[PDB]
Amino acid sequence: RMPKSKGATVLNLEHLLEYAPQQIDISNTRATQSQFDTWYEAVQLAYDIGETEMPTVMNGLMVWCIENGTSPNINGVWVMMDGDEQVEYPLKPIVENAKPTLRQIMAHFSDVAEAYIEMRNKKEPYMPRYGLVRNLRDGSLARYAFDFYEVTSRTPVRAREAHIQMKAAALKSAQSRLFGLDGGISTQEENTERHTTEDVSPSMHTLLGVKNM
Amino acid sequence: HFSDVAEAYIEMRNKKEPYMPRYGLVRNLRDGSLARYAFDFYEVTSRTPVRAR
Amino acid sequence: RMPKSKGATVLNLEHLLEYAPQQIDISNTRATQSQFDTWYEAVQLAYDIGETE
């Protein structure tokens, strides 16, 4: 039984049997390649950085986030290690050109981020600061403790459960508001009334029916 | 027309000293991080974050 | 699988494998070295105290 419309089959078996895309490629929880390219171009243009030294900046940005989150409200600057020196880059180009969200843009870095955290966990205890905030008590799950982790079909069940619990504990009961204060401030009506030297007051023209005694 | 450069200038002055524009002081804004957005001629665009808006 | 933009890889493996900063150095919950230096200079100037004491 296969879908039909006016007797003709709707699907295509020959293409379907050969259609094997990567799950993360068609996933809804990750920015499209077009949006990733647009964000990358916008960041590169804003930083006034050429193609040769932008990957280093991307290396630093991925690390910074693995630690301090990818919220939409992050502002200020993010820092990079140049030896023993701090290099500060403004965070406005990173979060303002990220569509649909910075988390979905940084989900592209998930595999490399996990590999980097497992590699740093070989020469020193390296739990990402997000894993410290969520009070994760297992170091072995340090490669999975960042907020832009992208759960795939290869993620182990224990890691998936830990990530889900971390997300639930971090989000809590945050109510989503669709609107804020409306930008229309004027709630009154424009006073088109005239003012003349004949008036008895700035608020009244005459005192017509008033009778004195 | 000066809105983008004004925001950049306030964020740059906010790197060597606490620089909240006097308009932000009059309105009694309690967050310093929103100091780049606290002038009356700010021009809200589609890139302005929701909290700033 | 590594990030790509127009076919070219976005990251840099050679620098990434050698990039091992201290966690507290890139942490968001601690003032940057520039801000710490500015605060230290401001406190020193306000107290009218030399570098020795």
């Binding site: 243009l45 804003a46 930083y47 006034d48 950085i49 040769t52 030294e53 990957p55 280093t56 900046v57 630093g60 990079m80 290690m81 140049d82 290099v87 880059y89 403004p90 | 983008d4 450069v5 950049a8 200038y9 964020e11 740059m12 790197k15 | 840099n12 050679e14 620098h15």
Partner: peptide
């Protein structure tokens, strides 16, 4: 691969 240093207000804005 040096780490670049950007300006506060780039002329390309």
């Amino acid at each position: 691969h040096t780490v670049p240093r950007i300006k506060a207000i780039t002329s390309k804005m």
